[PDB]
Amino acid sequence: ITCYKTPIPITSETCAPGQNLCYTKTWCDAWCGSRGKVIELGCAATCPTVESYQDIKCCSTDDCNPHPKQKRP
């Protein structure tokens, strides 16, 4: 399985041994001072959990774990 990273060069790469899912961390605070929305992508053996202000989305493929925001205008 592969997933998309967060950085500009959002690319698809295979996970480490034992993993099988990808996670999308959606949040906004310091860096979101205006419109700098941040999102942490990665991999995990199982769908991870979050709190209130923070959100997450688990998928079993990069096509489902990309960046909700392509590139800045």
Dist CA 30 CA 33 (whole Å): 6
Sequence ranges of the domains in the chain = 1-73
* Cα separation, 30 vs 65, whole angstroms: 23
CA angle at residue 26 from 57 to 53, to 5 degrees? 110
> What value, to the nearest 5°, has the Cα angle with vertex 10 and ends 62 and 64?
20
Residue 15 to residue 12: CA distance in whole angstroms: 10
Contact (Cβ atoms closer than 8 angstroms) between residue 39 and residue 72: no
Please measure the distance between the N-terminal and C-terminal CA atoms of the chain and give it in whole angstroms: 31
Token pair of 66, please? Answer: 């990309």
- Answer whether CATH 2.10.60.10 is correct for domain 1-73: yes
Written as one letter, the residue type at 29 is D
Q: What are phi and psi of 64, to 5 degrees?
A: -115, -5
Dihedral (C-alpha) 43, 48, 50, 55: value to the nearest 10 degrees? 50
Give me the DSSP letters along 10-24.
Answer: --EEE--TT--EEEE
